[PDB]
Amino acid sequence: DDDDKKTNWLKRIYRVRPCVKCKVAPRDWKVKNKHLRIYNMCKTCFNNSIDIGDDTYHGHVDWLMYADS
Amino acid sequence: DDDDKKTNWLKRIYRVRPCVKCKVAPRDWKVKNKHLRIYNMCKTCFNNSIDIGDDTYHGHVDWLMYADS
Ligand SMILES: Nc1ncnc2c1ncn2[C@@H]1O[C@H](COP(=O)(O)OP(=O)(O)O)[C@@H](O)[C@H]1O
Ligand SMILES: Nc1ncnc2c1ncn2[C@@H]1O[C@H](COP(=O)(O)OP(=O)(O)O)[C@@H](O)[C@H]1O
Ligand SMILES: [Cl-]
Ligand SMILES: [Zn+2]
Ligand SMILES: [Zn+2]
Helix, strand or coil, X not given: XXXXXXXXXXXXXXXXXCCCCCCCCCCCEEEECCEEXXXXXXXXXXXXXXXXXXXXXXXXXXXXXXXXC | CHHHHHHHHHHHHHHHCXXXXXXXXXXXXXXXXXXXXXXXXXXXXXXXXHHHXXXXXXXXXXXXXXXXX
């Protein structure tokens, strides 16, 4: 089944690239209509970044959750 | 830059999973509005499949080409 290929790709993508900042915590994410949005940082790092004023790592990649558009 | 993260993910995704049928040729693909469609087979295998009547491996996964939706 094709939808599973997307799912496993996304599971893998989320598992193998940790937070860009601390490099250990997994990343924050949220679901939005039909996309999975993976943010560049974990929450701890993201809130920290606001506190220290660095917007360098801000950002996300949106992923289509299904095999067909 | 966030768009590059998507691009490199897609380049990697295309490189590391070959044709599902022959397992060696890279897969057929085509671009469609803002998505990259990766088919499950190379062309050689796909045309072959039509010839032999197996629709088992027919299919594709569509990928958003950009980081933002
Ligand atoms: N954990 C995080 N790591 C990096 N960037 C983040 C994180 N959380 C939010 N952001 C950034 O905050 C901005 C607004 O995010 P979001 O609330 O997803 O957008 P919208 O306002 O369209 O709903 C975006 O630049 C997003 O990348
Ligand atoms: N190389 C291939 N490998 C596997 N399936 C394919 C291949 N080429 C086309 N198909 C299948 O043919 C069907 C029609 O494909 P396509 O022309 O992309 O759709 P559309 O008719 O919406 O433009 C889809 O099921 C697609 O997966
Ligand atoms: Cl996607
Ligand atoms: Zn972190
Ligand atoms: Zn093949």
